[PDB]
Design an enzyme around this catalytic site. Structure first.
Site, PDB file in Angstrom:
ATOM      1  N   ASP A   1       1.001  -0.872  -0.317  1.00 58.23           N
ATOM      2  CA  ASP A   1      -0.232  -0.220  -0.048  1.00 58.23           C
ATOM      3  C   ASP A   1       0.702   1.230  -0.285  1.00 58.23           C
ATOM      4  O   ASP A   1       0.413   2.341   0.523  1.00 58.23           O
ATOM      5  CB  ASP A   1      -0.406  -0.339   1.154  1.00 58.23           C
ATOM      6  CG  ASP A   1      -2.289   0.937   0.874  1.00 58.23           C
ATOM      7  OD1 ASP A   1      -2.218   1.153   0.261  1.00 58.23           O
ATOM      8  OD2 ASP A   1      -2.901   1.432   2.095  1.00 58.23           O
TER       9      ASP A   1
ATOM     10  N   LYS B   1       2.575   4.706  -1.146  1.00 59.12           N
ATOM     11  CA  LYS B   1       1.310   5.831  -1.607  1.00 59.12           C
ATOM     12  C   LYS B   1       1.537   6.588  -0.549  1.00 59.12           C
ATOM     13  O   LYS B   1       2.602   6.808   0.181  1.00 59.12           O
ATOM     14  CB  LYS B   1      -0.299   5.742  -1.830  1.00 59.12           C
ATOM     15  CG  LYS B   1      -1.134   5.527  -0.392  1.00 59.12           C
ATOM     16  CD  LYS B   1      -2.295   5.528  -0.427  1.00 59.12           C
ATOM     17  CE  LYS B   1      -3.116   4.898   0.863  1.00 59.12           C
ATOM     18  NZ  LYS B   1      -4.254   4.383   0.415  1.00 59.12           N
TER      19      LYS B   1
ATOM     20  N   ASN C   1       1.253   7.272   2.785  1.00 57.76           N
ATOM     21  CA  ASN C   1       1.947   6.564   3.892  1.00 57.76           C
ATOM     22  C   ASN C   1       2.936   6.444   4.008  1.00 57.76           C
ATOM     23  O   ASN C   1       3.373   6.199   4.263  1.00 57.76           O
ATOM     24  CB  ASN C   1       1.527   4.558   2.938  1.00 57.76           C
ATOM     25  CG  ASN C   1       0.151   4.268   3.532  1.00 57.76           C
ATOM     26  OD1 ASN C   1      -0.851   3.928   3.205  1.00 57.76           O
ATOM     27  ND2 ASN C   1      -0.954   5.159   4.672  1.00 57.76           N
TER      28      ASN C   1
ATOM     29  N   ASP D   1       1.753   2.767   7.870  1.00 55.80           N
ATOM     30  CA  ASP D   1       0.019   1.453   7.406  1.00 55.80           C
ATOM     31  C   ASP D   1       0.564  -0.084   6.549  1.00 55.80           C
ATOM     32  O   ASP D   1       0.789   0.372   5.438  1.00 55.80           O
ATOM     33  CB  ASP D   1      -0.269   2.388   6.227  1.00 55.80           C
ATOM     34  CG  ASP D   1      -1.619   1.534   5.975  1.00 55.80           C
ATOM     35  OD1 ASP D   1      -2.149   0.729   6.742  1.00 55.80           O
ATOM     36  OD2 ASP D   1      -2.596   2.265   4.293  1.00 55.80           O
TER      37      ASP D   1
ATOM     38  N   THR E   1      -4.794   0.378  -2.869  1.00 53.74           N
ATOM     39  CA  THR E   1      -6.179   2.153  -3.484  1.00 53.74           C
ATOM     40  C   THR E   1      -5.430   2.144  -4.909  1.00 53.74           C
ATOM     41  O   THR E   1      -4.522   2.593  -5.171  1.00 53.74           O
ATOM     42  CB  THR E   1      -4.602   3.163  -2.807  1.00 53.74           C
ATOM     43  OG1 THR E   1      -5.276   3.340  -1.684  1.00 53.74           O
ATOM     44  CG2 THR E   1      -5.960   4.132  -2.843  1.00 53.74           C
TER      45      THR E   1
HETATM   46  N1  LIG Z   1       2.427   6.355  12.839  1.00 53.64           N
HETATM   47  C1  LIG Z   1       2.102   7.194  13.135  1.00 53.64           C
HETATM   48  N2  LIG Z   1       2.185   9.265  13.290  1.00 53.64           N
HETATM   49  C2  LIG Z   1       1.291   9.845  13.042  1.00 53.64           C
HETATM   50  N3  LIG Z   1       0.520   9.496  12.193  1.00 53.64           N
HETATM   51  C3  LIG Z   1       0.048   8.174  11.799  1.00 53.64           C
HETATM   52  C4  LIG Z   1       1.245   6.491  12.113  1.00 53.64           C
HETATM   53  N4  LIG Z   1       0.179   6.120  11.680  1.00 53.64           N
HETATM   54  C5  LIG Z   1      -0.790   5.781  11.242  1.00 53.64           C
HETATM   55  N5  LIG Z   1      -1.286   7.097  11.174  1.00 53.64           N
HETATM   56  C6  LIG Z   1      -2.049   8.388  10.806  1.00 53.64           C
HETATM   57  O1  LIG Z   1      -2.973   7.678  10.823  1.00 53.64           O
HETATM   58  C7  LIG Z   1      -3.790   7.236   9.322  1.00 53.64           C
HETATM   59  C8  LIG Z   1      -4.441   5.674   9.724  1.00 53.64           C
HETATM   60  O2  LIG Z   1      -3.047   4.946  10.110  1.00 53.64           O
HETATM   61  P1  LIG Z   1      -3.564   3.604   9.122  1.00 53.64           P
HETATM   62  O3  LIG Z   1      -1.891   3.001   9.632  1.00 53.64           O
HETATM   63  O4  LIG Z   1      -3.196   4.188   7.526  1.00 53.64           O
HETATM   64  O5  LIG Z   1      -4.875   2.919   9.443  1.00 53.64           O
HETATM   65  P2  LIG Z   1      -5.890   1.159   8.864  1.00 53.64           P
HETATM   66  O6  LIG Z   1      -6.756   1.549   9.161  1.00 53.64           O
HETATM   67  O7  LIG Z   1      -5.160   0.332   9.345  1.00 53.64           O
HETATM   68  N6  LIG Z   1      -5.297   1.172   7.386  1.00 53.64           N
HETATM   69  P3  LIG Z   1      -5.511   2.382   5.779  1.00 53.64           P
HETATM   70  O8  LIG Z   1      -7.022   2.286   5.295  1.00 53.64           O
HETATM   71  O9  LIG Z   1      -4.335   2.428   4.878  1.00 53.64           O
HETATM   72  O10 LIG Z   1      -5.773   4.207   6.309  1.00 53.64           O
HETATM   73  C9  LIG Z   1      -2.847   7.269   8.464  1.00 53.64           C
HETATM   74  O11 LIG Z   1      -3.174   7.881   7.160  1.00 53.64           O
HETATM   75  C10 LIG Z   1      -1.336   8.567   9.698  1.00 53.64           C
HETATM   76  O12 LIG Z   1      -2.431   9.664   9.002  1.00 53.64           O
END
Ligand SMILES: Nc1ncnc2c1ncn2[C@@H]1O[C@H](COP(=O)(O)OP(=O)(O)NP(=O)(O)O)[C@@H](O)[C@H]1O
Length: 279
Positions: free
Chosen positions: A137, A139, A142, A159, A178
């Site tokens: 994923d 992009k 991420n 992510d 995506t």
């Molecule tokens: N380590 C981190 N530090 C700061 N922000 C983060 C971090 N991890 C995630 N985020 C934020 O939180 C959002 C969601 O986290 P993510 O790991 O993408 O969740 P998800 O629902 O498991 N996967 P997805 O549906 O692909 O977004 C991300 O798009 C970032 O904006």
């Protein structure tokens, strides 16, 4: 595998929301015992044996296992995991400088600025692929920056919700990220390997250089059709003063046959560099 079942609020205080996904909400937090700050990712668990809501335990455990293995400057790391009846809570390394997506929105980049980001992305992916981890994923959302107010921001890949270990060079489980960023083999439900990430890097690079998305159509299905057909071109309006080597790099990533696509090692030796799916 079972995780710490104490109340996370006994050990952390939460603050601002950092983001949300289809699986999770992520909040800034502070560990009481150290004063150190993290990103707490709350992933909603499945409530039944046959539900579509929430994330299956298998999928949560995969993301946790992969995160536990990682230690590299260009990837996030996992600090701790908690769970209760509703959520698994991953205490992740905080990346406080926002998404590369937000940074790009604020300002197209010069070739130097683009390679500054891209070399770090390539280093992170080289680490992951060395471990036989396909991210699946990649992009701009991420890719997150440590600090957005420096002239050459440091980045971390985040992510790991779709990441898989590739034991046999390919896996078959239909992973699907995506549409703008997925490789043809994802679109066509073919076996997938590390090569899919390399295609995503080609798409990222095209966007870094132009501010435009190479395959994006008006609907998800149109984007996917464009991806499968390798329906992109370098618009002169965007690329007329972009170096031919830069275009060469992208051309060698946006290749339908994964076997003919540059590998992560190839990309680091390239002369430009070398020193969910349904509407
Ligand atoms: N380590 C981190 N530090 C700061 N922000 C983060 C971090 N991890 C995630 N985020 C934020 O939180 C959002 C969601 O986290 P993510 O790991 O993408 O969740 P998800 O629902 O498991 N996967 P997805 O549906 O692909 O977004 C991300 O798009 C970032 O904006």
């Amino acid at each position: 595998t079972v995780f710490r079942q104490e109340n996370v609020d006994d050990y952390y205080d939460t603050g601002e929301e950092l983001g949300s996904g289809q699986f999770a909400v992520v909040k800034k937090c502070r560990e009481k015992s150290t004063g150190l700050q993290y990103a707490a990712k709350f992933i909603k668990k499945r409530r039944t044996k046959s539900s579509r809501r929430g994330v299956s335990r298998e999928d949560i455990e995969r993301e946790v296992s992969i995160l536990k293995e990682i230690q590299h400057p260009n990837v996030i790391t996992l600090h701790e995991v908690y769970e209760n009846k509703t959520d698994v809570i991953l205490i992740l390394e905080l990346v406080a400088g926002g998404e590369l997506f937000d940074f790009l929105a604020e300002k197209s980049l010069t070739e130097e600025e683009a390679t500054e980001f891209l070399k770090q992305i390539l280093n992170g992916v080289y680490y992951l692929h060395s471990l036989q981890i396909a991210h699946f994923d990649l992009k701009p959302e991420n890719i997150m920056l440590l600090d957005r107010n420096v002239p050459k921001p440091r980045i971390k890949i985040i992510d790991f919700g779709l990441a898989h270990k590739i034991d046999f060079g390919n896996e078959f489980k239909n992973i699907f990220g995506t549409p703008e960023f997925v490789a043809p083999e994802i679109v066509n439900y073919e076996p997938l390997g590390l090569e899919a990430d390399m295609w995503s890097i080609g798409v990222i690079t095209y966007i870094l250089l132009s501010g435009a998305s190479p395959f994006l159509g008006d609907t998800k299905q149109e984007t996917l059709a464009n991806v499968s057909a390798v329906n992109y071109e370098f618009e002169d309006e965007y690329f007329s003063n972009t170096s031919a080597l830069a275009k060469d790099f992208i051309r060698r990533l946006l290749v339908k046959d994964p076997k003919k696509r540059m590998t992560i090692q190839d990309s680091l030796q390239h002369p430009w560099i070398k020193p969910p799916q349904f509407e």
